[PDB]
Each structure stands twice: as C-alpha cells, then as structure tokens.
Design a protein around this ligand. Structure first.
Ligand code: SF4
Length: 73
C-alpha cells in the first residue's frame, strides 16, 4: 500500500537524506535510492519502493540511501 515512510536507521544504515550518510564509509555522493539498482518505483511525494524484503516493508525516500545500495551503472 502507501507503506509508512522509512525511519532514519530503519535497517542497513538507511538515511532519509542521502547526504546524511556522508559519515558512512560505504557512502559516495550522488547515490540516491532513486538511482539505486534495487530501486522499485516512485510511489508518491519523493517516496518509492525498494526491491529488498528487508526494506520494502517501509516506503523509502527517493532521496534516501542505504548500505545495501548498488549503482545502476
Ligand atoms: S537498496 Fe537502499 S539505497 Fe537502494 S533503493 Fe533500497 S533503500 Fe534505497
């Protein structure tokens, strides 16, 4: 459905703003959920799904990021 907007730190070091993860060793800039290889699709107001069972439970922000991120290039 319109699953609840994901918590900062829901799982896998996720942040609602990619930029927050500047502190995270695995982070590189430009990487947003919307450009994640595991991106599902955008659902609503800068929120969309993420194709991981350990994620899709909650609606991830398009500008979010997590450590399971893999680039789509
Ligand atoms: S794997 Fe992570 S970075 Fe990628 S869309 Fe899902 S929550 Fe976002």
């Amino acid at each position: 459905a319109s699953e609840p907007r994901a918590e900062d730190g829901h799982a896998h070091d996720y942040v609602n703003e990619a930029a927050d993860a500047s502190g995270h060793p695995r982070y590189q800039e430009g990487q947003l959920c919307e450009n994640c290889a595991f991106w599902g699709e955008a659902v609503q107001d800068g929120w969309g799904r993420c194709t991981h069972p350990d994620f899709d439970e909650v609606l991830v922000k398009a500008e979010g990021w997590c450590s399971v991120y893999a680039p789509a290039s």
